[PDB]
Design a protein around this ligand. Structure first.
Ligand SMILES: CC(=O)Nc1ccc(O)c(-c2cc(C(=O)O)ccn2)c1
Ligand SMILES: [Mn+2]
Ligand SMILES: [Zn+2]
Length: 345
């Protein structure tokens, strides 16, 4: 109602059916913030121990160089040589790169935005893989069983990090820039272990305002691409958002907790120290209209585009002809929960 980030605490019985619970948190309005936390039942664990992954290879570690001032920044991601987790961790916990001393989140937050452009960190990002054991059937990021699977059930198409899992090994001050998901999908993020990850979110109903702000500050960027925020290079501080009246909220994700982003929910954030997160995209019936209307990067060829055709055919058959003819003028109402939420309404 205030479009603020909500947190949920499912029972183990509730935790069993992933799609149904997302339908439930949406019936509670969680999607309005564009971001929600889910704390799993105490009984649940995805892997017995994380002690046997020191030899896992991070194929393409990136150094995050950041340039900018007064709350506006551009981030250049520079690929470094491959690396084992053990090698990463020891860099991460080294004195040069480890978390500074701090009392409250607010202080660490100030330190992040103050030292953003100094001493570039390394982010072990976009590693193909899962840390779930094969037997875990609840909230398994490797096989969430949502209608996004249609991309690989009806079509034979695989998209790394999108319907397959990605691992993110973070250290202090590693960042994810402001962005929505590819095709404005949902995403799920599970923090396996380590120091926290802090998130900023803008409600989907005020997302355009964020985009107008960004276009204002980066007009050359705006001109050379229709959706340059999809480059995931743009950092904008909470003080800049507050100054220009963009509504937003912030939340800190601890180890063992899930974050869900919702369609067209802009988010950004940073890692507090050494940690590991797993994520992928997923969809619900509500996403389809977002997919249909998503504005994509127009300046790169290696970017993610999902043929919406099969989703329209299967879930909106009465609109298929109209859509295919270019006359579908459905307007998205960001406050409405996905259809599956009828059960709880
Ligand atoms: C390097 C890249 O393609 N960026 C990217 C693409 C899609 C995403 O969902 C995220 C992302 C990453 C995180 C994270 O690094 O923890 C959190 C939320 N979103 C980051
Ligand atoms: Mn994301
Ligand atoms: Zn582009």
């Amino acid at each position: 109602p205030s479009a603020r980030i909500m947190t949920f605490y499912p029972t183990m019985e509730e935790f069993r059916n992933f799609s149904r619970y997302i339908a439930y948190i949406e019936s509670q309005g969680a999607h309005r913030a564009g971001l929600a936390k889910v704390v799993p039942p105490k009984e649940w664990k995805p892997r017995a121990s994380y002690d046997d992954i020191d030899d896992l290879v991070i194929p393409a570690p990136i150094q995050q160089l950041v340039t900018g001032q007064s709350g506006l920044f551009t981030q250049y991601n520079i690929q470094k040589k491959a690396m084992t987790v053990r090698e990463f961790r020891k860099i991460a916990n080294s004195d040069k790169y480890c978390t500074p001393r701090y009392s409250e989140f607010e202080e660490l937050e100030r330190k992040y935005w103050k030292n953003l452009t100094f001493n570039p960190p390394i982010y072990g990002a976009d590693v193909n893989g899962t840390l779930y054991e094969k037997h875990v059937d609840e909230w398994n990021i490797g096989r969430l069983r949502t209608i996004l699977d249609l991309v690989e059930k009806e079509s034979g198409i695989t998209i790394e990090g999108v319907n397959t899992p990605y691992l993110y090994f973070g250290m202090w001050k590693t960042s994810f820039a402001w962005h929505t998901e590819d095709m404005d999908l949902y995403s799920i993020n599970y923090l396996h272990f380590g120091e926290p990850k802090s998130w900023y979110s803008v409600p989907p109903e005020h997302g355009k305002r964020l985009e107008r702000l960004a276009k204002g500050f980066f007009p050359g960027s705006a001109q050379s691409c229709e959706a340059f925020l999809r480059h995931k290079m743009t950092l904008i501080s909470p003080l800049m958002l507050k100054k220009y009246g963009i509504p937003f909220d912030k939340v800190t994700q601890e180890a063992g907790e899930f974050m869900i982003t919702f369609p067209y929910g802009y988010h950004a954030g940073f890692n507090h120290g050494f940690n590991c997160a797993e994520s992928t995209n997923f969809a619900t019936r509500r996403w389809i209209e977002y997919g249909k209307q998503a504005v994509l990067c127009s300046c790169r060829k290696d970017m993610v585009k999902i043929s919406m055709d099969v989703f329209v055919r299967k879930f909106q058959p009465e609109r298929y002809k109209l859509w295919k003819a270019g006359k579908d003028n459905t307007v998205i109402d960001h406050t409405l929960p996905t259809p599956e939420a009828a059960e709880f309404l």
